[PDB]
Amino acid sequence: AELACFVSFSLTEDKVVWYPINKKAVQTMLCAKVEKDQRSNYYDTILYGVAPPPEFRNRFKTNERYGLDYESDQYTELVNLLADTLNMVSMPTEKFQFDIVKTVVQVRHLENLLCRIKDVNDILNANVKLRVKAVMIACNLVNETETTPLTESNDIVYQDSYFTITKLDYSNHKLLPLMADEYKITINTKTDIPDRNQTAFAAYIRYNFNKFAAISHGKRHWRLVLHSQLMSHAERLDRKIKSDKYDDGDMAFVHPGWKTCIGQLCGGTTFEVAKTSLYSIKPSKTVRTATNKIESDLISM
Amino acid sequence: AELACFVSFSLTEDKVVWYPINKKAVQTMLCAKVEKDQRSNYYDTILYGVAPPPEFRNRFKTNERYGLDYESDQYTELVNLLADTLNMVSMPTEKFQFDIVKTVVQVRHLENLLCRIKDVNDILNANVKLRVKAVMIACNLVNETETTPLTESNDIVYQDSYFTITKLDYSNHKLLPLMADEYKITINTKTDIPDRNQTAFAAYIRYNFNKFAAISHGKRHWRLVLHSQLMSHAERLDRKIKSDKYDDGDMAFVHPGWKTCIGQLCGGTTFEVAKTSLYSIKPSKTVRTATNKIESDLISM
Amino acid sequence: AELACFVSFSLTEDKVVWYPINKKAVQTMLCAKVEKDQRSNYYDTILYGVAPPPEFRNRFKTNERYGLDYESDQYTELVNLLADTLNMVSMPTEKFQFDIVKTVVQVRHLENLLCRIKDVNDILNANVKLRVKAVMIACNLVNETETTPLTESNDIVYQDSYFTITKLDYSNHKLLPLMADEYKITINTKTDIPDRNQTAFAAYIRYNFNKFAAISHGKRHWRLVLHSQLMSHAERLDRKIKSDKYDDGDMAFVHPGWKTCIGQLCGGTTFEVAKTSLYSIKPSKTVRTATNKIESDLISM
Amino acid sequence: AELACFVSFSLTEDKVVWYPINKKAVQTMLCAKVEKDQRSNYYDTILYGVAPPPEFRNRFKTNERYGLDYESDQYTELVNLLADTLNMVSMPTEKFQFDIVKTVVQVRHLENLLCRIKDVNDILNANVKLRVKAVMIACNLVNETETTPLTESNDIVYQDSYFTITKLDYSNHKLLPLMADEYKITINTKTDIPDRNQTAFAAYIRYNFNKFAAISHGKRHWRLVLHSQLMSHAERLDRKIKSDKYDDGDMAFVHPGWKTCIGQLCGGTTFEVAKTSLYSIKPSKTVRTATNKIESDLISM
């Protein structure tokens, strides 16, 4: 969804002031009758304040469409987290550009952050500055590495000196519910990670998550997805690339088929030709031996 | 626990008559003062009927002892299932042997049968003959092979035309809670299983249960156990091979290490020497190739 | 209360027929205006059946009087238990004596039998013959000895082969709540009890119920009472010895002081003179030695 | 458990600042992969702050082990009570020594203090200074007499001018649950207690708690334990003494067997030789007569 689906703004003062948008205004908007040449503008509900411009009605859920469950208590949380965060970022009006509210944000990412921000023990619960960093990242408003302290989810399922694996369960998200077994791999810091540890981690990943492939969409973090899903994620990373008119990190645990397939795409190869490599490359034997090692060590010891 | 921890009997009739043992009875005999010369006899509680021989109090849970949670509503259930069942078998008084009462029963297995039985959708809900057979097997009172219709669990996680995988989750049992992470493979029919299917299944579990090894305690059914447990089950089967004073079914999917290690024990080799082939033997390549193929076909389809 | 506070009767049939008395009936006769010449007759409520003779209203609880909480769901229970029971006895009309209706009943004892009876694990739940006997005893309509199968309470706190100790807790009764801290000792069989066991038990209660004294109101069952109550029970038994116009069972465990004090009263000595031997007589040394031995064996075993 | 299982610290400022440790950090720690030469150090969860060093993982409960129910709301209470208390004690960094966090504290003691501290009527609920004294005592961080105002439990079951008996019920403790009938005897103040009162108290104790023995582990307070437990407590006071490479108070109520047994231990005697005295010494006749006095006075009066 576009940032405009969650917040509206004012340029009266010297610093752009943002405001939350409530479930009633969105409701009134969706039913109201608006002239076409006026659908790009935030709609005034009169009784409930400003609402997203009609142009984006397609992002909200109806009795027939799939979209943001704007009626969810979660929507109110997200809407406030955003307004707060943006006002705090305090951007100068003189440089404000309307097309910013058209920035597409990562709604499921943000929702998980709420759970982290709301969690008493989670560092983000008290680190106002980190929270702002996590949120700007999630809003695709800034280019920064999603290192562990900032990762969207905190359900930790693995952690060593260098990496951290979090479970991304959307099943219960009350905003954009979704079923998909997914895990996220983030680096604890930007320190160089010796092949020693990379290899080990790669062997761990292959044993404990053998049905998943660790891939990267370019940034400095990786997702674990079911083999039955590479094909799709690949397609998606195809349209994206065909819209830039890429740094996996060389990490030893990155799925070889993906690594090669994407390689080809970034070089002009058509998807219908490169999709083949996803299942065509065999894992390195350095990792397969490292994998069998973990197994027999568990059996024998 | 011994069958005598759940049922008492009468021999006045033509066939043996079994009776349920209640929690008050048990509570009473655990506090009663019984002379040594009587510890092995069923105990008369006077107010609550017959309790189990004091010789078995070890078996029950105490404020500081792990045992049957006979205070549980699940104990009443099992207790009645056993009586009802035994009564049907209608074993002849004349041929009755008090020793039967000392038969160690598979408590957690029975606890699962209880769930299958109270399940209206399960065949054991209405089919009595099968119910009696499933329970007798669970009680170690019959040699019959545990085919699929008689397995201890409903939780079907996989089923092709020959095999069925069911989840053994003891973590939530009210009688004897347990954490072990296991599944059970049972054939649907005592019919000869084609090699093509044996191998397909072998490949199926390699990819879907890579952390496990399918073993056999000698019968024609299998348990998927964690590699970090393979030893234990190996030792148990050994101590069992000790008291002498094994039909692997020779199924393609049985863990190779186990296959031979248990072969070495049956020939006379000491555990100290055979425990090695458990983690030192590799699966066939026909199987590896078959499992990589699953991953591949799963990546593109 | 008199049996007539719970049941009315009919003599039209061959055997006497008893009927339950309900709370509305009672409520009605307590407010009705009855001429003196009628106070001793069962009262016809017209709308709610037959209420108890107004001559007994004392017996019921009022906004400012302690009595049977006939408004209780427990009154209905007892009322029906008594009717059902009496009906079974099938006493012959011709030999019926209205006086039976004036028999003082052991209300708290019956209240406990109710608990034993609704207990599915208790023998009185299904065994009717025993139930009738237990209730008749509780109603003072039979001479029978209160053996263990017939005691008023389930709460078994101790049981060796000859005796059984049950807890008498009136504190939670709905009919006639009471705080007295008592237990009851009953023999399991009218068989001769060896001296070795008598003494063992004597030592057993000295260490396990040191604050109590096992007494007897003459029958073959005993009540463990607080030393700070020994007098009271001593006086009661005295006032009872007055209305003349006692089988201690001579059990080794009966409180010595009581043993003789009650001996002195039966010979003719005035309470003023015998009430002394209650706290002035020591237990045997065979018993003291036996009780110190319990403590000792308990310290090291 | 070692203090490190509940709090972490910082030496940045001039006074050591302590911080609570939450159930998530402990959780992440228990699963995380840590290099051996790093298990002595507090572990950084990144998302949940600092956790106890892996070296002490053995103190936390798992799905298979018995330990601190760190997931309990009680753990959060204890963790905060500790941090607060320690920061308040305000210790100078210049003198800080790491090995302090290795101090083993009395977890059940502390838990009872929470109930006292949380109790509106309990003086500790408002006496910040006493609370700090109770807590330092419980943490084995200071040597001070556990006089009544500071005793771990406030369930008072006896009290006269000089002594106070509190019930220690662990049955419901949500941290380290435990079944054990125990009572504690603490002096109201350090005043000398005339033999007159000691004798009396000794007689009271022997009557109202005859199944218990009043013992002391050296300090100036006493525990009441079941005779069936002396043997154990003795063993424990043996290892302790055999680790000092003792002032009961001479109190008249101290169990003679214990007094003598411990005497011997402090003199080199082996436990297997001294354990004998626990059940070998008879109570003084001054106390046995004082005891029989209470009894007959209750009967007669």
Added chain:
Amino acid sequence: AELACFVSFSLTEDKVVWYPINKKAVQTMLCAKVEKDQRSNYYDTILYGVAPPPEFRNRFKTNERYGLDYESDQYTELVNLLADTLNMVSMPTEKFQFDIVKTVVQVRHLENLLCRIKDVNDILNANVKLRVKAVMIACNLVNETETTPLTESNDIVYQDSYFTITKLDYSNHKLLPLMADEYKITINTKTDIPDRNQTAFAAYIRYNFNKFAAISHGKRHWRLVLHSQLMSHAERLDRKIKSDKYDDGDMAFVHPGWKTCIGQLCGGTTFEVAKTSLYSIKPSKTVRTATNKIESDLISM
């Protein structure tokens, strides 16, 4: 309401068969479009059976009309009581008169009978013959005198050997709620009532219901009404005396004013002239003296 608002009938059998009318039926005929020529016929709902003649819709409650709350669970009750009842009367088809269906029923009276009937302690709970009589009286289908066993209410507030006072509380009815503060006096038997008792009772109600006046609508039962209502009931009885195109029972306790006022109306005097003797006539002095005596005896006893 007319009997036809609760039951429909069939004449195919030997005796008339009655059927219950349900709320959906009613809901349906209230919304259905019926031609004038049909309003007086039972309405066929097709989906929910037979509804009442539309000629009576006035009688039911609407979002803005006071009527039978047929949506109530109490309507189902009454509806079935009436059918069951009528069926027992087994009135002969040949002699059936559709007019019976137009009989105005005593809805609030029946609502009370329902309570008496579902009361297990009430005689109408099991005694069917009496039940049928009580209901027929309530339905104005029989001349029988409303003696005590048949009164509409259980709530017994007084009862001597001849009379019974029951509380008529409509305030909580689900059918036709009402506030009127009334009680009902009914004789327990049609036997001659001695003057001594008549007068005692007269004095009894003067002191216990001084705000009321016991009146009679002609039958042999009485209603205690508020003096501030005496007129109303006086007018009603008058309008009744109009449609001509009264057995006071001559009971000593009947309100004198009423006694004569109703006498004057039966002779031919206009209400305008008789309504006076209602508040202008004094009670006997034998009664005043008798009532002061109650107060007195009540002050000292």
Added chain:
Amino acid sequence: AELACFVSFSLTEDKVVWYPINKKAVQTMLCAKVEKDQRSNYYDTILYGVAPPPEFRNRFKTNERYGLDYESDQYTELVNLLADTLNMVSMPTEKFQFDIVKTVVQVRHLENLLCRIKDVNDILNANVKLRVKAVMIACNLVNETETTPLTESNDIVYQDSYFTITKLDYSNHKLLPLMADEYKITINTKTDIPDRNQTAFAAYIRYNFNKFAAISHGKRHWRLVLHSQLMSHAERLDRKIKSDKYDDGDMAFVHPGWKTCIGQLCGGTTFEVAKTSLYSIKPSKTVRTATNKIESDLISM
């Protein structure tokens, strides 16, 4: 109960400071062992602060005695209301006298005040000064007229220019529960009340509360009690008077028997001679005519 049962005090500062007493301290006190010559002193619980002196244990409820339900949340309310109120009254230490805590207060009165003080709409809910006046009156600590603004209860059931009738229902008091139909008559102010209004009120009272007698215990307020209770209240006003080693107000509505009876008592007459007048005096005919007037006016109008 004596004020000491609710609050303790300190004379350290210049103004007496009072403190509440909690249910735990009272509990500890009731069980603690205190020397006789020390029962007049407030008892120190050490763990729960100061408690009432043992001398007054008889005022607290046990498992066998009737008294202050000190365990009730109401006790905590009363205890605080008192402490606050007394500290606010701020009495000088120099004039403090111990025997003040021995002042017997009106517990039920105070409890009703709590309900008034806790009531949002009740003026006392915000009028700190009135509350203090109501409370001092209730505590028998000051001599002031209980005019309406201060009357213990606010359940108003009648009110005209001069008087106010409140219902005193103790049935639900959670401190000293009590069943007794009682009403209170208080004057709205000290203005003289013309015979005109007195007469009227007297006639109203006799009609709407005919079973009650309006009496006075001397002060300037009156209670309405059942005739069946005059006798008692009289006895009580007898002992009181026989302990003074009286101004009803001449109010027309005061019960004549009471007026005369008390008259005699204040003149030496023995109670056993004066109790006679309670039922011997007839009401004035001025009030009986005024009474019949209200009745026929209600009938006629």
